[PDB]
Amino acid sequence: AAPKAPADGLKMDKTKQPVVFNHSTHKAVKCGDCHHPVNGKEDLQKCATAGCHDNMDKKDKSAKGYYHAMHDKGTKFKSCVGCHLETAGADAAKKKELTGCKGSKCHS
């Protein structure tokens, strides 16, 4: 059957700055905008699976860079921060909540 979203409260914890991901706040986003095509097939593996976004060098801006995939603009798929920047627009409160590097809903 079509895959179902998991429970809220999923911790992304590849790094020492873990972030909690809630599917319930991301329903307006098609599943494949995140679990994106790889070889033409929407891929439901963990983002940092070997051969995926497995480089824990936060300086790497090639596709395999995990930090890059979560923070950067101009990516083939929207990143967490990229989409949130667009969402917040000029609203400073939303910029803080959704894009702040600290004291945000990502990095609380």
Query: How far apart are the C-alpha atoms of 43 and 66, rounded to whole Å?
Result: 16
Give me the residues that bind ligand HEM (CB under 6 A), please.
Answer: 3-6, 10, 12-19, 21-23, 25-26, 29, 31, 33-36, 38, 43-49, 51-53, 56, 58, 63, 67, 69-71, 75-81, 83-84, 87, 94, 98-101, 104-107
Q: 6 among the known binding-site residues?
A: no
Cβ–Cβ under 8 Å, residues 80 and 70: yes
Paired with 41 in beta bridges are 38
Cβ at position 90, least distance to ligand HEM in Å: 14
